[PDB]
Design a protein around this nucleic acid. Sequence first.
DNA 1: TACCCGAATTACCCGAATTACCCGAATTACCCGAATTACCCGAATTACCCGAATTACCCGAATTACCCGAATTACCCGAATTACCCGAATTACCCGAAT
DNA 2: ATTCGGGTAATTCGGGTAATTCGGGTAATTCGGGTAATTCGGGTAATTCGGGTAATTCGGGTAATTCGGGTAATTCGGGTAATTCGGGTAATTCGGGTA
Lengths: 54, 55, 56, 54, 54, 54, 57, 55, 54, 55, 54
Amino acid sequence: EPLLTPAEVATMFRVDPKTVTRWAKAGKLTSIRTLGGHRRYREAEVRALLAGIP
Amino acid sequence: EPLLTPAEVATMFRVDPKTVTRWAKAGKLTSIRTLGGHRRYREAEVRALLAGIPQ
Amino acid sequence: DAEPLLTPAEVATMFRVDPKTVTRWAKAGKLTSIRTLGGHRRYREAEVRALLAGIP
Amino acid sequence: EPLLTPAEVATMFRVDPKTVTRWAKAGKLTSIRTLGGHRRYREAEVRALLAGIP
Amino acid sequence: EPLLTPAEVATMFRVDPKTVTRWAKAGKLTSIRTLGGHRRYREAEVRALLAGIP
Amino acid sequence: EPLLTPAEVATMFRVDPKTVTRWAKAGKLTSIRTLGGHRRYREAEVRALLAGIP
Amino acid sequence: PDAEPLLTPAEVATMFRVDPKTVTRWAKAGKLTSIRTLGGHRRYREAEVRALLAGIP
Amino acid sequence: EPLLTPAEVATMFRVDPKTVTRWAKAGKLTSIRTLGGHRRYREAEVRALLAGIPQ
Amino acid sequence: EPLLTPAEVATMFRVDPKTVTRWAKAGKLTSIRTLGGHRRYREAEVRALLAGIP
Amino acid sequence: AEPLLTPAEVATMFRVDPKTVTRWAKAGKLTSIRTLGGHRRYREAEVRALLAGIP
Amino acid sequence: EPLLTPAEVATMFRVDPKTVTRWAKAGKLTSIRTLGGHRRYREAEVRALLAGIP
DNA sequence: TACCCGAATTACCCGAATTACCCGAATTACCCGAATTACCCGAATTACCCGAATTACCCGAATTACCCGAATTACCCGAATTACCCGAATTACCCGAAT
DNA sequence: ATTCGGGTAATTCGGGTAATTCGGGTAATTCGGGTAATTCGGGTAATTCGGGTAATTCGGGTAATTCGGGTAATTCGGGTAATTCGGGTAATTCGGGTA
């Protein structure tokens, strides 16, 4: 799978990482976790979101 | 693509954000919703409009 | 990279002139205009403040 | 056993190989040194941590 | 003594057979010669080196 | 005169019974044929060549 | 003396690194000379044997 | 009548004398006991059986 | 009385001249002494034993 | 007229070489009777006796 | 004198008549021929000889 | 220039939801020289695909080997007896004629 | 029938070495029976031999990945402010005309 860092995600949405987080822990964004406990998101679904395909 | 928040698109027209909405609500300005509903506009599309190129 | 604009009434007030007389100055092109998506104009601030000092 | 290079382990998590290494040095991952020094990882173990199965 | 082909050793270390042969020339590993020149390596020691025993 | 069947001889070199039959037919190994034709090789001959003593 | 030195299948077998049963078939194939003991066992001319190991039909 | 000792037969057939004795006892061979009891054998007979001539 | 020498009796049974003597002293054979010491043996008696009739 | 035996005859009785029977007589184990020529002759009774072992 | 025929001389000496006739002819035995030629030998000369007194 | 009139577009008030920016702790991204590993490339040594042939191997049955203490038999030996060895002289045995 | 008489071949003198033999003693052999390995019949499964093509590994080189370690940038966390959402009513602007 191809992952995005929160920084990258936040950018495509013109939003703040702390939001993508609240977005993810609010269950709107499937998240993976780094062994260090940092999040990572599935590009495919991020894109699918921007293009507005629920 | 580089986006602008309504607060920004508004300041580029000396116009209230709430009007920037109407524009997008009538399809005069492509919009991109964040997961929360808040809109967000394509910097490209705005610059081209300040120049006056119908889209 | 952003042009500061003025609302017509904002420009009018700056000349003790009426808004509908700014439109004239616009449709006669002594003043640069930028249209909103609705149709209403807005004017380049650096431009008017220049006319005040009298600098064509 | 099938193995992974620190290049690959990092690519899967979207992380720097200089960090996958810090992971092993902290014990969060099984390392297997080559005769030269380079590390190497167990594919199973890694793909287990993506799904988050500690 | 049981033996492995350089390819085999490579697969085990997730490393190029070329590299296994570099290891050989550098004494990091015992080689054994076929009457055609091909190196064969003692399973005993490679298996121990994975483990981490010089 | 103790000997080794090609099977055995090749299991010591990590090689195919074909390649042994090459070495003999090429002249790097003393061969001894049976009434049937199957080759068979001087026992020591081999182990010697295992250390590097032609 | 007037006596052919003989070998037992086991012994011949050892020399060729081969199973008795195989030598015992080299016999019934006329590739070798068989001498039957009064009981049935084959014995082989040590002379004939040693020869073939050098490649001399 | 040129005779052979049991060992002599044995040495000819590549066999242990106990077997040559076992033969004369199984009747497959003419035995000639000495005054003491030890078996002796007729050379001709032995020579034949080597060739392959039953008798 | 046709007579046999010990060397004669011996070659007949495939035995040693000495043994034939031991046979004589054991009374298994009628010996007849020369005027010197040597013994002779009655052929009738000897031929009869090789057959199998005491 | 004693019944007489020639050396060849005595010899043949003992399975011996005549040349030896002479040594018997030349030594005294036997009675010799010389012919005019020189040859010896032997007393049959005497010989016939020594066969049974009668000194 | 008392006389013996050549046979009677022969038989006594265990010898063939011709020998007697040769003993006589030689001059070792006194003979006296009949009218017809056949010889006769002195019985008392003969016996003196079997004993052996020249 | 104003100020005149429909039609339109734009600027506020709001309550509820969303998202920005604040502290510090913790994880992570590239920094660098130095070493290790991946590929790029021809002559050569290996690894399997193939059918005919040889060898290895599985089976109950019979034959062959080697266990033992007792008995008989083969040599090691020194001294006497006996076998053949040489020429020359003695004996037997082969033919007619007579006794 | 024997002898005379007369010419061989076989025997027996004479004397001297090899060869047997006698007499007694010790290691090798055969004797009388029992138990485990080897061969004995034929048949199936596995190895090898003859030759042919592709993948590997032998020879040496430059670029990339990784290593050891050390600051900045980011991302963990919560916790108010400020934007934005969605709906509603007046203010401004748009398009022209006359004093």
